[PDB]
Design a binder for this molecule. Structure first.
Ligand SMILES: [Cl-]
Ligand SMILES: [Cl-]
Lengths: 130, 5, 130
């Protein structure tokens, strides 16, 4: 229904906004694009579901997110992939792991601040109906 | 039926 | 006649069933009971015919419904009252308005699926005879 589609259009505008804010942060630059298959050929062999902020934008535009909870699922994925791939004691890994958690924490904190629970609740119920 | 909404 | 009374007994069993299904859905909890006159003292002043699912059950048991069309008249009322009382742009109202249409649509769709048109047609003709 038109009313349902309009609810999801509002969600999409919001999710693009949140993602664009994450993407312009210097800390998060490494998470903005897919891992280059040549530079890191072994990335595919250790990570089963690659995710990054430009992909997240693609999925938004493909109407793949119907809730904020589905969006955050992918943000968590970005964080958890970085933790899996870069687990070493050395400072260069620590930095990446810290940036990955900072990205996650930031996304949640934006949502906690700016999202209406009743708007999200509506989105969820339209989704369950489908 | 009727359970999709 | 006993045959007529039995037709309406069958209708009543069906209507209780449909109503009990609506009433256990979490989305529709707000519509299950009459508005508390204290919490919302202004409800009476804006809505002329309050209706809810527990009242609908009372009317069933009081033999007030002789057709399905009369039952659906009250379901429509529940929906239309919620739309009138909660008309605002804010998400909390949108949620209630969707929940209200979802209740209506659900009731119709159950009836469309499960009701024999000839059984309904019989009910209607007994009613016209009275
Ligand atoms: Cl550590
Ligand atoms: Cl609406």
């Amino acid at each position: 229904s038109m009313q349902e589609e309009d609810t999801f259009r509002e969600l999409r505008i919001f999710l693009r906004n949140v993602t664009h804010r994450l993407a312009i942060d210097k800390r998060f630059r490494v998470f903005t694009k897919p891992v280059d298959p040549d530079e890191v050929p072994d990335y595919v062999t250790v990570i089963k579901q690659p995710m990054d902020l430009s992909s997240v934008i693609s999925k938004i535009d493909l109407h793949k997110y119907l809730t904020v909870k589905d969006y955050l699922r992918d943000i968590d994925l970005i964080c958890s992939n970085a933790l899996e791939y870069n687990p070493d004691r050395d400072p260069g890994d620590r930095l990446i792991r810290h940036r990955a958690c900072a990205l996650r924490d930031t996304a949640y904190a934006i949502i906690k601040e700016e999202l209406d629970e009743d708007f999200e609740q509506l989105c969820e119920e339209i989704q369950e109906s489908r | 039926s009727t359970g999709g909404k």
